[PDB]
Scaffold this active site. Structure first.
Site, short mmCIF file in Angstrom:
data_model
loop_
_atom_site.label_atom_id
_atom_site.label_comp_id
_atom_site.label_asym_id
_atom_site.label_seq_id
_atom_site.Cartn_x
_atom_site.Cartn_y
_atom_site.Cartn_z
N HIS F 39 0.85 -1.16 0.00
CA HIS F 39 0.00 0.00 0.00
C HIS F 39 0.89 1.21 0.00
O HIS F 39 2.13 1.15 0.39
CB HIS F 39 -0.85 0.02 1.28
CG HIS F 39 -1.78 -1.11 1.42
ND1 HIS F 39 -2.78 -1.40 0.46
CD2 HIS F 39 -1.92 -2.07 2.38
CE1 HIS F 39 -3.44 -2.45 0.82
NE2 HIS F 39 -2.93 -2.88 1.98
N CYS F 89 -4.41 4.64 -2.89
CA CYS F 89 -3.43 3.63 -2.95
C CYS F 89 -3.27 3.26 -4.41
O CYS F 89 -4.16 2.81 -5.03
CB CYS F 89 -3.80 2.45 -2.17
SG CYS F 89 -2.67 1.08 -2.18
N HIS F 92 -3.83 -0.41 -5.61
CA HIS F 92 -5.21 -0.85 -5.38
C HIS F 92 -6.17 0.23 -5.72
O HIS F 92 -7.27 0.33 -5.16
CB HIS F 92 -5.39 -1.30 -3.92
CG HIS F 92 -4.52 -2.44 -3.56
ND1 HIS F 92 -3.72 -2.42 -2.44
CD2 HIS F 92 -4.29 -3.61 -4.15
CE1 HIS F 92 -3.03 -3.55 -2.35
NE2 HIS F 92 -3.33 -4.28 -3.37
N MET F 97 -9.55 1.89 -3.45
CA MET F 97 -8.94 2.08 -2.16
C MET F 97 -8.62 3.55 -2.05
O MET F 97 -7.51 3.95 -2.22
CB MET F 97 -7.74 1.22 -2.00
CG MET F 97 -7.25 1.15 -0.57
SD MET F 97 -5.91 -0.05 -0.22
CE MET F 97 -5.48 0.33 1.42
#
Ligand SMILES: [Cu+2]
Ligand SMILES: [Cu+2]
Ligand SMILES: [Cu+2]
Ligand SMILES: [Cu+2]
Ligand SMILES: [Cu+2]
Ligand SMILES: [Cu+2]
Ligand SMILES: [Zn+2]
Ligand SMILES: [Zn+2]
Ligand SMILES: [Zn+2]
Ligand SMILES: [Zn+2]
Ligand SMILES: [Zn+2]
Ligand SMILES: [Zn+2]
Lengths: 105, 105, 105, 105, 105, 105
Positions: F39, F89, F92, F97
């Site tokens: 992340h 992120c 993602h 996200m």
């Protein structure tokens, strides 16, 4: 190389000796407190290549130098632009204590 | 005064239109996400005047832009040195998606 | 002094040669793109003295270097804190392409 | 920790109380305008660790403070080198209004 | 877009005309040396948004301007925070030569 | 105060828990690497108050975090403007996200 500029001539004149200096990329300019202190080196925002205030502020030695021998160096690396850099002494501005550095590139 | 550069030609080519642009101090360069995303603007530390990494990092839009219309502007003020600024698109580097900005002064 | 660190060993291994280097204040560290490109130098915010993110970002050469000979230098002057600086190569992180610079002072 | 330094002693003397202070990394130094204004805090390029002019300029509070209570803080984080930092008050320099900060590390 | 502020009213008063100005991001504020020189523009560290000393130092034109017509511009780009910016003239501070710039955003 | 935001929910979802957080001047936001790494925290230049790219770059933790427990803190001091800060992120992003921090002032 290293060019020495004396703040206050031996003759007791309020000048930078030499007043005009031509420097090449990589050379160093050394100001040495000589006669009749105090002195400082000030570059105006519009007296440097591109009128960069950020550049002028970094080169300007605003603070006053009193004791003989005190020096201030500026190595004109690849970072610094080419052109003429005009500077002066604030306490002796009326006396015409002005200088000029030409960086050829 | 405000030069628009399209990221991805209308032709569907992975290029910056225009690829070469000549700017004057005070002018702004506007990048607009056009065709075949994503795109980003990256300036290498040695591709900017004086090889200033600090300068390259500030101009570099590292993050990827996906939606059409997304823009990124850079107003070349007095704080920015004169010279050529070469940039590129990381995801389309192999396709030769390279650009060049020449600031006159 | 100037310490040269090769990105990618002569043996064709994904490593920094040398991996560990001890530097003194003033000394420079030169990374040279050698074998199996691309490579980059990344310093994490918590892998530098004092966990300074501002410091890590300035040292990190995020952009990828492809052509052999491309270099990146860092002169650890007085402004840089003493301690260990751990860095890595993002594209070859899984291969354990990690480095470490210890500045004594 | 936070060390308070009064610009102008209670006794009516042109001094910094305390004149000498020893600080640890992280600790802060707070200057409070007390008696006989104006005052300012100036650090010379050669009076800071490594003779860094860039560092001296950031710490120097060039502007004059007149009203009592006016403060100026400096948190000596990891980014700041260890060593002695000598500073002074320009308008009261002849009176010997000088100070000294020693950062242990 | 470009707001002109005269240093010294035509009336011969030691003021900034206008004293208060409201600017939008991207706009430029131009100070022109008019009457009763010298003048300078000083921003205190606590008179700018966020009390950023780094920001105040960049905007402050410390050096004295003597000849009429001399100008100093500041383009309030996206890098500059929104809020009020209070500035003053050091040689005419006692006369109440104070100014204020409010950046809306 | 200190608000903890988990990168990756306990449920095994690619989200920030909490997704929306309201912070007051002086509070700290702590991101902790929880589930399904890697992340990172990225703030776009136009997703922060005033569209300040300089501000977005300082807050953005570009580098990928892999080991659980790794944290990244941001103390929203008086320096940081008030408003909403949207982040995401990169690995993602397609999973949505995304996060949001609202600094009230
Ligand atoms: Cu002089
Ligand atoms: Cu592209
Ligand atoms: Cu590598
Ligand atoms: Cu004093
Ligand atoms: Cu005035
Ligand atoms: Cu993620
Ligand atoms: Zn000027
Ligand atoms: Zn590079
Ligand atoms: Zn980190
Ligand atoms: Zn000096
Ligand atoms: Zn102040
Ligand atoms: Zn953007």
């Amino acid at each position: 190389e290293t060019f020495t500029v004396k703040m206050g001539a031996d003759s007791g004149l309020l000048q930078f000796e030499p007043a005009n200096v031509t420097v090449h990329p990589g050379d160093t300019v050394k100001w040495v407190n000589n006669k009749l202190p105090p002195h400082n080196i000030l570059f105006d925002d519009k007296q440097v290549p591109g009128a960069s205030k950020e550049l002028a502020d970094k080169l300007s030695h605003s603070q006053l130098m009193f004791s003989p021998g005190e020096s201030y160096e500026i190595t004109f690396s690849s970072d610094f632009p080419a052109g003429t850099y005009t500077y002066y002494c604030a306490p002796h501005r009326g006396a015409g204590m002005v200088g000029k550095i030409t960086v050829e590139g």
